[PDB]
Amino acid sequence: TGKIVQVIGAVVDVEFPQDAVPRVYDALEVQNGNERLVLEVQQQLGGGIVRTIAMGSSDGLRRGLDVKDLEHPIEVPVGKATLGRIMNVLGEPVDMKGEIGEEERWAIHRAAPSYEELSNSQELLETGIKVIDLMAPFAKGGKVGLFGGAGVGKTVNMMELIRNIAIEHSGYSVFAGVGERTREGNDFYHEMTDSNVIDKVSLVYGQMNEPPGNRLRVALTGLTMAEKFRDEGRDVLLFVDNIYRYTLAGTEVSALLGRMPSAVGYQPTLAEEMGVLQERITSTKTGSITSVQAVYVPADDLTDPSPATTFAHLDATVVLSRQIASLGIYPAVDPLDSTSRQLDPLVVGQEHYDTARGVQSILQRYQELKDIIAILGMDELSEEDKLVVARARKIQRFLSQPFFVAEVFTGSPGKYVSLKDTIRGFKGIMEGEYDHLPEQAFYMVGSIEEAVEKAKKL
Amino acid sequence: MATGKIVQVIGAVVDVEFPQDAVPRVYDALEVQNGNERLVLEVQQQLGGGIVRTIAMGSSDGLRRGLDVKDLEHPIEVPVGKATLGRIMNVLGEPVDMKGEIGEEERWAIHRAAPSYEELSNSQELLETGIKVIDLMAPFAKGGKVGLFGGAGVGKTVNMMELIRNIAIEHSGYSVFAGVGERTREGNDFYHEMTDSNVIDKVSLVYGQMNEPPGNRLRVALTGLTMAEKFRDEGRDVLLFVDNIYRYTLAGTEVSALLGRMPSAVGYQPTLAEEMGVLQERITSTKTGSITSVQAVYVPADDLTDPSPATTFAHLDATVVLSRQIASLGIYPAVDPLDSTSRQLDPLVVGQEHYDTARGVQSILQRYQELKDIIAILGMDELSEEDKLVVARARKIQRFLSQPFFVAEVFTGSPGKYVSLKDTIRGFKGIMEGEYDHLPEQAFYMVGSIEEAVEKAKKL
Amino acid sequence: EFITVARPYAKAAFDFAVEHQSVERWQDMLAFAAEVTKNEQMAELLSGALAPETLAESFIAVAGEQLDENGQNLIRVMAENGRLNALPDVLEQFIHLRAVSEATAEVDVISAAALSEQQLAKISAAMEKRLSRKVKLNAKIDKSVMAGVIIRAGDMVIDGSVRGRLERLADVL
Amino acid sequence: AQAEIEAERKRAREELRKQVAILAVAGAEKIIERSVDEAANSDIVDKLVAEL
Amino acid sequence: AQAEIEAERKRAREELRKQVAILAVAGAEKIIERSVDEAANSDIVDKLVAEL
Amino acid sequence: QLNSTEISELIKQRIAQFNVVSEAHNEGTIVSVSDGVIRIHGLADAMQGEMISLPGNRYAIALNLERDSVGAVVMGPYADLAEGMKVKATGRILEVPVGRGLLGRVVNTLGAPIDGKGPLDHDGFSAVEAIAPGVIERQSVDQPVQTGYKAVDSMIPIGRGQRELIIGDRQTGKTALAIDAIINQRDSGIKAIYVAIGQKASTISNVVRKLEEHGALANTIVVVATASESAALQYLAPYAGAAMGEYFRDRGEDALIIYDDLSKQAVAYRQISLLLRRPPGREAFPGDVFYLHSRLLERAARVNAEYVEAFTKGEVKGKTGSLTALPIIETQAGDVSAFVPTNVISITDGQIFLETNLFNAGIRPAVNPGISVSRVGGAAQTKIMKKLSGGIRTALAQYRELAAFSQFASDLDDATRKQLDHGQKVTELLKQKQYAPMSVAQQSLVLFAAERGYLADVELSKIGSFEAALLAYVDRDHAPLMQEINQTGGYNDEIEGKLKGILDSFKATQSW
Amino acid sequence: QLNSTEISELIKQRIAQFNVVSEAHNEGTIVSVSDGVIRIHGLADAMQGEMISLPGNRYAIALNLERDSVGAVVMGPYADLAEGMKVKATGRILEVPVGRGLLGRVVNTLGAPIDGKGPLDHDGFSAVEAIAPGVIERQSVDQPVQTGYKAVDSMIPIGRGQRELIIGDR
């Protein structure tokens, strides 16, 4: 009932009769040779023209193809039948298993919960990782973000958090793959199936080889499944493989939609597009979503508008840095930028709070000394400034930890460290009861005991 | 018969409307009569509707709308071959000297593709320049690009004149000089310094003076290159000197901005890497002859990361640095042996004796620089016998990198010398391994061969 | 070039002209409007910066023998948007819209030899089977084909020239 | 040294092959132009309109 | 090996002179459905033969 | 034997093949020409990504279908085109010849050959734009790709189907490392492809002549787009190369592809993108520049046997194919934090970082540990290489850091002294000459000798002599073990005992 | 060359009657919808900054008055709107509930209660856009506003009627 009238890249314009023009976000459909293509409506132009993004390869479109108007949004399989299966952005099954036996389908475009429906919790969630739940502890039903440049441990950290949190989590889990390597997705799927935990995980993949419309909307498909498990009243985990790719796929399309560029060439609507996703990934009085999001930062630039607007949407932010990864220290977390809403005396107790502020105070003071150390070296420092530098270097090394997913790399066995045990270790270093061990003793050890044992082995 | 009409004039940019069936092709040349002078336009873009957009090869002042434009069906064509030696031309191949009309048995278009894959030479020969510093420390591939990274004050032009002389005498090559964006003053007195040194009959000069509109300066670089292509096609080995490659880049930026294309990178044109590639890929060794090129390079802001340096250094094979300090020592030519480099220095192409010798003198001169700091802070008493031997040989090596040119006889009065590569390898092999330790360092200065150094010593 | 902005006016004028049956009057009306646009003294005026309303009624005064209730209205709308130089293109697109609606096509026949009437007759039947439309053949004689016949239904081309078959052989080798 | 010589055989074989092919069409051009100024055209166009 | 190629280069081109005439005639009668009796064509193919 | 008859009979076959019956085609006129961009009026039946055939044997690619025109880019010299020329629409989407008959050919990015070796033999055509196999069709990478070089095989191992960025400054050995990888597959049964984007034609001819000099050329396809050629040909050059590599992957064979400068592709796409006035982003590249390199590299994959069976309609059973990619990026002043370097670091499975400070110090190949990594991990190594390498990477990274502070002050505590001696001997042991690849038996002896401590009592100036004598000693007498370790890279206590006896006897009995 | 919402059925209406009747200047039709901006054709009497009523109970603010177009921004969920919907201009600038009964409430920017504690007990409405008191209507600030932070209330005092920027990183 409509005809294609322009084709620019991934953007397709369609003409309809004046009485029949589609609503915004309705799904259209086209024969592209032997393929079926879905188009999602973005804008209504004058005169029955409607402008759309292709949810598939745009190659091989002529002008003048007949387009069929399906009078509803993109709607995806939802609920308990979606569990242990891999899906397209369009909710089609992508594993070689059969049809998804869904009882219900929901539209991927939804409003966020009302302010009256939100809920708050102080309940600490414990993790295996010394630096994370020392410096940036996070709570059941809250949001966590891992920020970093390329190749600094965003994925390895999220894969440890999957391991460690799934120890004490019983309910279902959702994983949205937005713009990350397919090989990872396949390794993860075989890890989940070979450990039989797959029966509780629902996976949505729109990986980086797919054209822009897939990468933009696949994030929303992942949320829509997690919002069902939440509205059933469960409590749920949502892991998002790289949320930056959603805003970048919006940038790749924006100029073709005829919009003047903003700032560093971004779409003018950047802050609304980010908010309208992030505000529906929340807990509520009926149930709770706990979520970890990876956030790539382009060119290591922590001040680019896309990272900068993402920082406001998160409860715990962990900031990785290349300079620490280059020193071998993993996980390459920066204690002077990583923070949490939950690091309060009332929430975590005074001893934890006081130990975390002690670690920050020492490590900041070590940064203040690096310029004089660079120009003049250490012998011109004050006699307790040498002591600060010796404690700060020991603290830097004791933040490092062996991970069970890094045995393929380190070969060293992995370690899990309880909260009580890590705060005791850092407090003891700051009081100086370990001020006679060498630095190398603190590298890659799970607990302080293991450092004194390693110092016995030199 | 003329058949286009001028539709717009906006500064240097001129739009012309031809009939719908006769639209000129890109880079075609057009002529108009601007008052009582002809003006040539080069076509840049075919807009729709038979309108064509061009840039004026001269002043656009006094052009009306509605003039008649005559369509030459070729690009800008220039005279080529032997008849152009010792003449001075503008962009268009018109004589700007007053010696009058050129012989012109032939004229060629300035625009061509580079040699195809089967035409390239199936070998990797060296060029024997005759200069001890260059042939040892920074040898030229035949058909390579060389960058002269030194400021004026240092002998740039005398080095250029010496290469012109040696390639004309000791080979059978000619040279072409392209003054891209040159000050008219320096253009005048470079011509007099070549005429008063008898090298003028062995070089062709094309000058783009800075007071010419941007389109002139860009195309001058191609006018030189097409003349060198003729001498190559005659079977010679040819030298092309480009007086500044940075001014070609900037002329391409200015023209691109006049045409209104979106800028790129640090405000350069979007076509930057293509326009450099279009020049540099025509300068190669073929199976008939070769063009070697020596190109002066200016680095903006002293920044080697800027796109103009970064694009140019992809094409350079050798890199010669000229030093104010070495000139202060009185050592001429003033090449710096430690920052000059060539990617022809490998055993696989230059052989192991030459590679080992060049690596050797580099190591000795580097070690000497460190020892010369120790001497500055603590005097010569700190040096061991090994250190004193290293310092002595380093001073002899430094002296022996000097040479008298046939161009420099005006000052030194000594006869000039051309030194074969074998003789340089013998000399530096000798000085490094401690032969000739028994004759003084001033015997090596400005001499010539090492056989001439000892014969200087005998009565020095 | 006004090829893209002429479409709305061509379509709107053709629909109205269809409702009121006066298509054949609208075309002569548009042809006159196209011809006043080409005049030497008028094309100077159209380029000047007169106000649109003053410009419109000056053109309307020259445009006698136009349908004062409807034909003039269109010129007024177009001028109010300042697109009168699209009218010579609106004329061609009006002719095209008519040719579509009348289910009638024009196609061109080209050969080195002037065609004999039986050749032209069989072509007309063949094309009217290849198309729904009726065809008015145009004879063009060009020695280029050397031999054979070039069929040119606008964008659609069937080549039957020897030369074409030759320079198509040369590339196989 | 053998592979270098083998490439020259291929390059000679192609070089000659190219020449015979251009000369064949250059011959067919000259043959056709002189010989078709007849009702032979009528033969071609009748087949074309039958195919058309 | 190159000198051996030079000898065959002379030999091979002389063979293709005569074979070019056959191929050119065959290609023309492929291109036009009706064949040609060579009535005025001998002089045409002989100029083709002479050039190679 | 050069034979005149067989040439004549071949032309006779082409004359016999020719079809005189014509076909209706949709036509258009060029309306505008500038900088290799075209605007065409007509072509109502064109499709986006189609090939338009122009006057001559050139083509153009249809980029935009506007309402009343097509925008296209010319794939060749554009300059002799003119407004009003007719253009014809081929129903083909951009296609490239593919097959095993391409091995030993130098080819243009349109698939026309550039060498003198005459017309091509191909097994049909493959599409230049394709979407990679989905997540269920991959398999994990578990087989080695042995390079020539001690440094990368021990510290940064590459598996079949891995993607491994070679990054560094100019004149650092990026190309040398990649062609030495190609040459070492000369006997390993992996087919090779080398794609030269924007390189100098002199360099390209010298590389091809060095591939032929070592006999690798018969196992490589070479794809060329020189620095002189139109930017569209450069931009499409690596996509054409990928389409040939996918032929072997989908038949269950293994192939290796080198992209000689993806930074030069991005510049060419930036030129075309800015000539189409598309609003630029960071460092003036478009946002599509991630999508450009993403869709290219994400085809370098390993696929499971059910994909190969389903693709080849069951003609190949149980085999698994792979395409292994080594993209090269040149980076300014060693800045690993610039935009395009960081885009590609985020697409590949690791990086080998080559440092000019090491290269200028004569440490060649100049691999910087700590930055360099292989996300695939040891799964790419043979057991013996996995066991013998172990922590050698992190020991070298720490040795380099310790040397930094040791330069600054004197605090030498014996174990520091031995750590410095060991690290200095390992770096002197890891440098290696160009074009001198050494097999896994040779590499495993060298690693065994380094980490079982045998280089004790050996001078640094003797290290290169010590290896040259050792590899000749084991070539002379204990050759059968070498043939065993090269066949199956199995590490046993039996083999460790034989290695121990070889190194004990050499150290005790021989001289260097 | 590009079109300017000159489209076929509107032009044909102009063909039928160029001097189209006065009708109501009060109303018009949406011709485009995108990203929460709508373009409206008609509304000859719409004032700049006036509230335009939309189908359902939604509003837009007229921000661009152009040559036969109004650009307006939608104050809510826009994606339900469609081309060819009728719209009517009010007489109204945006006004908000105001009063003492707003203390202790949480409201959206239209002043609708969002805490769920039920309807407001406001004291009439006030214009959202208003002019400040002039120079002669001010008085000097002399009374304190006590922050309770030693560093602020000592070093950086704030008085009644001051405008004190708090600025920093995240």
Ligand SMILES: Nc1ncnc2c1ncn2[C@@H]1O[C@H](COP(=O)(O)OP(=O)(O)OP(=O)(O)O)[C@@H](O)[C@H]1O
């Ligand atoms: N805890 C660790 N121990 C040892 N090595 C590590 C650790 N974390 C990261 N690495 C090394 O650094 C690599 C980069 O981290 P990861 O694999 O998570 O990629 P990333 O930083 O997520 O980059 P991308 O965002 O592109 O996926 C790891 O693959 C591994 O090579």
Ligand SMILES: Nc1ncnc2c1ncn2[C@@H]1O[C@H](COP(=O)(O)OP(=O)(O)OP(=O)(O)O)[C@@H](O)[C@H]1O
């Ligand atoms: N193993 C090696 N030992 C010594 N020199 C080497 C080695 N490998 C390469 N080189 C030298 O490095 C130089 C540059 O080689 P190559 O061109 O491969 O480096 P590159 O960084 O790829 O250069 P480019 O950036 O120009 O492509 C050459 O002189 C080469 O001989």
Ligand SMILES: Nc1ncnc2c1ncn2[C@@H]1O[C@H](COP(=O)(O)OP(=O)(O)O)[C@@H](O)[C@H]1O
């Ligand atoms: N071989 C040489 N012998 C004597 N003087 C030299 C020699 N080479 C350079 N000079 C001196 O160097 C100075 C600068 O040389 P010149 O070619 O004018 O440099 P530039 O033209 O770049 O300023 C002049 O005084 C010149 O005489």
Ligand SMILES: [Mg+2]
């Ligand atoms: Mg990641």
Ligand SMILES: [Mg+2]
């Ligand atoms: Mg290289």
